[PDB]
Amino acid sequence: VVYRPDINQGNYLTANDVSKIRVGMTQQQVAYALGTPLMSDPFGTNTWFYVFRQQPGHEGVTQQTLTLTFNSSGVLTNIDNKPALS
Template sequence: MKAKVLILLLPIALATSACSVANFLTPYKLDIPQGNEITADQVAKLKTGMTHSQVRFLLGTPLLTDPFHANRWDYLYSDARAGVLRDKKSYVLIFEGDSLVSFSGETLPAPAKFQSAETSVASAVTPAPAAKE
């Protein structure tokens, strides 16, 4: 009787332990940002009438160029953390000939300004008053 119960419970025990082992052996999932990061400060520099080369210099090469719509450039950005899509943005530029006509879409926030190490140290340290003789 005990042998029959053991034979019936053994596959269940092996199956449940295999699930926990599979979770333990799952590979690390990388944080993967992909595409063009278009920030608000970059978009502030865009102006209608800019040429293809000026826009490419400012924003970089677009991720997608549609061969059927050569006048449209799509800048796409996605950010996946631990295998989960957290952020997805797209920015579209429309050209007429070689000049920019319109642009719209979602941008990333402008990066914070960096302070130089000398500035932060200089403001933190105040000179000692000179000794009177």
């Protein structure tokens, strides 16, 4: 009933770019393809979080979470893609 503005959070992801990521890319190659992360793990690890969250007014919350774990050498070693909330 009461109007609630749409809320967006996180960086914008699309299938056309998510399909671009491959094991072995450098941090600069990934940042170029997808852009600068808005979330990272500060507590002593080299992990980037690409969170795509949308909450349209009085609709359900939708979220895609792409987690990238890098080696301390600056090499992508693990990709974990959650397409939806549980």
